[PDB]
Design a protein around this ligand. Structure first.
Ligand code: A1ADP
Length: 324
């Protein structure tokens, strides 16, 4: 039997189509995973190929929780640590944020989405260490989900990395994942530090996870990611009434004949709820919105809000706090 919940599939389809039409976007995808089994509860694309599984994107800012997790898991970084977040150069390349802060602690790096801050956490590790971590999340790895034409994505071998590449990969450029691989990677945060396999068949046996970080680290990162959907966070549009939601926003410039252009974006929103003990992961991407905004929060946040809130109601999960 399929693991797909037709009520969630219908909800995802309606909300995705409403957003793609409203933002006059080229395409989009929604994935809903069971946060503790890796079963696919919903998987919808705009008409055409199964982009969720066939197409690879640069994850951009939705990659940031992973270097943050690795830094905390190493014991080299504490959540309360502060970093110099001023723009800086690696040879002729600039690493910078859209909004400059001289310093941010780890919660601020997550809340505000600091490329600089994330890069300073990656830079404490060797290229081999960071490659091994990305490989352990499934980047560049076949999921064997059961879909044909499944992308493995791209993870360049660390032996070829220029120092600028380690930095940009930490904030999601210079490596590529499908949306299904990115939703899968988030099971490291939801399943107490173990990466789950993904499947669209109902599970009969407990999936065997692979340990990537400590359960204590996963719990701390989920707490940090709630800041994204609260006041001051980039993902406040994705807040769900009656729950705490851990999430990450990303807006990525697209690559046109090897150059990043400022008039073409991919908007991504990924999150999980209830934040402290999540039941589901919801991943949304909308390709080239052209009307009514282009930022993750405004384009994909509302899709995430409706799909996550609707999914929790369908699965019979009670709100953990009074509604407002
Ligand atoms: C996360 O997604 C962040 N997005 C960016 O920083 C965007 N940056 C890029 O597209 N970008 C392209 C390629 N390179 C060289 C490898 C870069 O260094 C690079 O940064 C971005 C910046 C400005 C824009 O106007 C649009 C996109 C952060 N995400 C958002 C968000 O969630 O939407 C933010 C709250 C802050 S930037």
């Amino acid at each position: 039997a399929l693991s797909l919940d037709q009520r969630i599939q219908t909800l995802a389809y309606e909300e995705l189509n409403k957003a793609v039409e409203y933002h006059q976007a080229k395409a989009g995808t929604v994935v809903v995973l069971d946060a503790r089994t890796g079963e696919i509860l919903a998987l919808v694309n705009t008409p055409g190929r199964n982009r969720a599984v066939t197409d690879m994107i640069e994850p951009g800012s939705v990659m940031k929780p992973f270097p943050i997790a690795k830094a905390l898991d190493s014991g080299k970084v504490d959540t309360t640590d502060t970093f110099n977040t001023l723009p800086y150069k690696i040879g002729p390349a600039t690493v910078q944020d859209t909004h400059v802060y001289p310093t941010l602690d780890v919660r601020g790096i997550m809340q505000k989405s600091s490329n600089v801050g994330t890069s300073k956490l990656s830079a404490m590790f060797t290229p081999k260490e960071m490659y091994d971590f990305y490989h352990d999340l499934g980047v560049g790895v076949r999921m064997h989900s059961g879909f044909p034409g499944e992308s493995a994505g791209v993870l360049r071998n660390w032996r070829k990395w220029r120092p600028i590449e380690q930095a940009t990969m930490s904030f999601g450029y210079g490596l590529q994942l499908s949306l299904l691989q990115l939703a899968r990677a988030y099971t490291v945060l939801t399943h107490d530090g173990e990466l789950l396999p993904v499947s669209f068949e109902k599970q009969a046996v407990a999936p065997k996870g692979k340990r990537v970080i400590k359960a204590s680290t996963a719990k701390k990162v989920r707490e940090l990611m709630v800041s994204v959907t609260e006041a001051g966070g980039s993902g406040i549009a994705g807040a769900v009434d009656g729950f705490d939601v851990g999430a990450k926003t990303g807006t990525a410039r697209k690559l046109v004949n090897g150059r990043y252009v400022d008039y073409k974006h991919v908007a991504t929103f990924i999150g999980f709820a209830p934040a402290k003990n999540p039941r589901v992961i919801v991943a949304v991407t909308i390709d080239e919105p052209t009307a009514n905004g282009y930022y993750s929060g405004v384009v994909t946040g509302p899709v995430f809000k409706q799909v996550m809130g609707g999914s929790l109601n369908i699965l019979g999960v009670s709100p953990t706090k009074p509604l407002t």
